[PDB]
Write a protein that binds this DNA or RNA. Structure first.
Lengths: 102, 115, 128, 148, 50, 131
RNA sequence: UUAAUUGGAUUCAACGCCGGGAACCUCACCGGGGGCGACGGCAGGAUGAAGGCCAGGCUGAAGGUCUUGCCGGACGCGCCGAG
RNA sequence: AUGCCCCGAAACCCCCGGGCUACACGCGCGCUACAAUGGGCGGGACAAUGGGACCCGACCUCGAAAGGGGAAGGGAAUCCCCUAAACCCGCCCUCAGUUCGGAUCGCGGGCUGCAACUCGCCCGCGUGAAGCUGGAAUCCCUAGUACCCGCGUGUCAUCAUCGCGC
């Protein structure tokens, strides 16, 4: 048996959910075992910078954040099933990386 | 007589550069192992031609980092302190030291009435 | 029967079955834990449970995260929950409640994030 | 009973005194003239300090299994005073535990798994659990509660 | 003679993309932005406050 | 022996030998420990039972530490400037060595010599407020 | 004090602040060296480089400078407006 | 960004060096202590946050360490930094400017950069002082907070006693 692993990474939660739902709906339509989307840890990039452009006054800090979410979808080997995924309309902010594990 | 690590200046003369550097501290020996700068090598050409007499110019320099070897002994060289070329004459006792040590750049500070 | 305990960051997973009475922490015997105060915190609940319940069941608790006091408190938490589930008796439940409310409730206390103006020393510390 | 059923310090002491017998374990000629770690400030006090290290190291192999030199260096490291600067943690030196581990390999108690470290042979497991059984049998008489 | 010498290291090596200042540049995963320059573009990059 | 003279310097017998040897300048605790180990004696014994042949053994250890098993890196002045040899100096020899180094730095007219002349910090310490 | 220790900041709200790291770079200080000054007009051009170049001297050194003479095969000295 | 003025072989641009560190000094904020709850040898259980391709580098080897060589695997839930310190136990030293306290200075070795004398860090040895509880006065904080403990990270080839965070 051969398994296809799909990593879906995006800042926007709703776009990630939409793409995952699209893959899911393709799955049972194609009738192939499709392991549910496992939400891996969401990576949190944090940057702390002084607010004051100059040096005078009180010292104050601003903490800006990115939360990038990531879900894992494992599906089984059926060429029809894995043919229907390049045809998916993918939003710009969502990145999909598909690999093949034995 | 002058002795350096149990060897005299003339004994120091005949030692190869590697064996000579083995007498130097870790800083200077490792600096030598890493290789002199091309500007340092030009200055070495200058001083060596001076020691053979061909180079008659009063010899200046900017390379404060040029580590004094026994072969520079007995020559007058003028190191740039930042504003002018302060003169130094190399006695045998500067083997194992940098030129910039003997090229003063900061003047004496004494204390007067506070503002 | 399975039970869980959370204290600060330490998390203790406890499993209780019928057995002689062997109690193990991370697979280690209870009586040998070097910090004696932590040994007493771990021993606290089954003291009031009774030697009969002690010698009627075997317990294995595995704890991860936090420090040794936090780990001991998590094991203390999980032991009480395991006992009250195994026996299914409210008498010892109220016994523990009377002895310590957190025994079956637990402490949801968490460390506040540090804040600027010399953040290294804490959320509220500032310069002179 | 296993090593898990006895205190670490008592078992380490027992393993050290037992391993004093085996000729495979011998301090190197540089051992008395080197301190156990960079973080340490004063040289080791007792002349037995070598063997306790070996007794310690094998115990770690009984628990951590495949372990390399650097992981033990982090373990045996400690806090060091930086003068007026605040203290800081540092790893332990490598040569001491390397010689101890290579002697252990010569002693046959431990083996090497390349790319993963060194692990404990069955002979070492039997040695350690024998010592632990004796120690627990004694502490059963001193402490009856360990019979449980 | 007019070419600046190639500095891979030091403050001179890195210059802000936007304003070009040689001072504080944030390099967390490849920004190359002056600390002043970061505040006006962080919202554009998708940064949010929390 | 409440008083024990070794190498021209007295030590208290109440201190342990590794603790007693510290009173000599040129010897720290680690040097005392390693020389005691060279002697094959307990580092923790009281110095007041030091029978004299041990005193002479420690003395000849001081005379040539390298040949007695001590490596080249436990001495205070490895690769001595006028012999090329790693030697452990003591007392007046140590004072003369540092004194000669001071006049050497002065004679070469190095910055370190200048600081030693003016009694100023050598190694870049900031002195606008400090010192 | 220094040739120079580049400047700002004055209690609350200036003084591990701008500097969020000064060996070069940062650089704004000081000393020394070197190159220019867009584009127009006056004049020149190419008859040949404006730029580099051996051997040197000066030059810390850098055809930077000059002795020497080549290229380079192409338009750029100097003054004014203005950069 | 940009008003006005000025600077045009300079107040334009490029290169070397010094300097920005210099100090009888006062002041600001911190660091380490002014030892017995002390100092030290052995041993044990113990976390989190973030970061990782000219990178993390497990693992192996040599060196006493600083480090040198080889090196799997890792572009990250999967490999690495990764393990802690404060804690206790067993034992040794035993209230003394001394063991604490280390400023300070000499030698050797290692590390980054082409270059650390001005002006780096680290290691081994030697010296290693002031410091033995601080008047007037004023500073912060009210719960997982204060104190104590260490760690990660920003700047970072190297530089922290800094900031942010755990």
């Amino acid at each position: 048996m051969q398994k296809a692993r799909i990593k879906i990474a995006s800042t926007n939660v709703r776009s990630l959910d939409e793409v995952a739902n699209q893959i899911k709906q393709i799955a049972e339509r194609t009738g192939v075992r499709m392991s549910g989307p496992i939400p891996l840890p969401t990576k949190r990039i944090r940057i702390t910078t002084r607010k004051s452009p100059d040096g005078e006054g009180s010292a104050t800090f601003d903490r800006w954040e990115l939360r990038v979410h990531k879900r894992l979808i494992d599906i089984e080997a059926d060429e029809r099933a894995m043919r229907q995924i390049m045809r998916i309309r993918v939003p710009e902010d969502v990145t999909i990386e598909i690999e093949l594990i034995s | 007589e002058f002795r350096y690590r149990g060897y005299t200046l003339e004994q120091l003369m005949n030692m190869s550069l590697e064996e000579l550097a083995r007498l130097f501290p870790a800083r200077q020996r490792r600096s030598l192992k890493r290789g002199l700068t091309p500007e340092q090598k030009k200055l070495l050409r200058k001083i060596r031609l001076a020691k053979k007499g061909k180079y008659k110019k009063p010899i200046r320099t900017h390379c404060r980092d040029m580590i004094i070897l026994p072969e520079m002994v007995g020559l007058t060289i003028y190191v740039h302190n930042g504003k002018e070329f302060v003169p130094v004459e190399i006695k045998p006792e500067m083997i194992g030291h940098y030129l910039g040590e003997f090229a003063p750049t900061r003047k004496k500070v004494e204390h007067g009435a506070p503002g | 029967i399975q039970t869980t305990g959370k204290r600060k960051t330490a998390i203790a997973r406890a499993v209780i079955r019928e057995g002689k009475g062997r109690v193990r922490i991370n697979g280690k015997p209870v009586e040998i834990i070097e910090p004696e105060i932590a040994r007493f915190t771990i021993l606290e609940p089954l003291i009031l449970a009774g030697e009969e319940i002690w010698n009627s069941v075997d317990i294995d608790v595995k704890v991860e995260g936090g420090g040794f006091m936090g780990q001991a408190e998590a094991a203390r938490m999980a032991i009480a929950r395991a006992l009250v589930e195994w026996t299914g008796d409210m008498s010892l439940k109220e016994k523990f409640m009377k002895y310590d409310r957190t025994m079956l409730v637990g402490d949801p206390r968490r460390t506040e994030p540090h804040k600027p103006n010399r953040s290294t020393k804490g959320p509220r510390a500032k310069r002179q | 009973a296993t090593v898990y059923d006895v205190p670490g310090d008592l078992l380490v002491e027992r393993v050290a005194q037992r391993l004093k017998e085996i000729p495979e374990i011998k301090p190197p000629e540089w051992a008395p003239f080197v301190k156990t770690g960079r973080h340490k400030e004063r040289l080791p006090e007792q002349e037995d300090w070598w063997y306790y290290r070996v007794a310690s190291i094998l115990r770690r192999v009984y628990l951590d299994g495949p372990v390399g030199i650097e992981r033990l260096r982090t373990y045996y490291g400690g806090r060091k005073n930086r003068g007026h600067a605040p203290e800081k943690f540092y790893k332990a030196g490598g040569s001491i535990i390397r010689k101890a581990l290579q002697q252990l390999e010569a002693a046959g108690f431990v083996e090497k798994v390349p790319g993963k470290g060194r692990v404990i042979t069955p002979k070492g497991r039997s040695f350690l659990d024998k010592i632990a059984t004796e120690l627990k049998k004694e502490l059963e008489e001193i402490i009856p509660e360990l019979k449980k | 003679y007019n070419k600046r010498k190639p500095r891979k290291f030091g403050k001179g090596a890195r210059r802000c993309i936007r304003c070009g200042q040689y001072g504080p540049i944030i390099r967390i995963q490849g920004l190359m932005l002056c600390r002043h320059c970061f505040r006006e573009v962080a919202p554009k990059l998708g940064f949010r406050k929390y | 022996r409440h008083i024990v003279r070794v190498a021209g310097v007295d030590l208290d017998g109440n201190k342990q030998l590794r603790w007693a040897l510290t009173a000599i300048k040129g010897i720290g605790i680690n040097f005392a420990t390693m020389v005691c180990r060279v002697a094959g004696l307990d580092p923790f014994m009281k110095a007041g039972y030091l029978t004299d042949e041990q005193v002479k053994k420690i003395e000849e250890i001081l005379a040539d530490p390298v040949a007695h098993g001590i490596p080249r890196w436990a001495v205070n002045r490895p690769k001595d400037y006028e012999t090329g040899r790693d030697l452990h100096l003591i007392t007046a020899k140590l004072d003369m060595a540092i004194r000669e180094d001071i006049m050497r730095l002065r004679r070469i007219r190095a910055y370190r010599g200048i600081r030693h002349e003016l009694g100023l910090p050598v190694r870049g310490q900031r002195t606008r407020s400090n010192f």
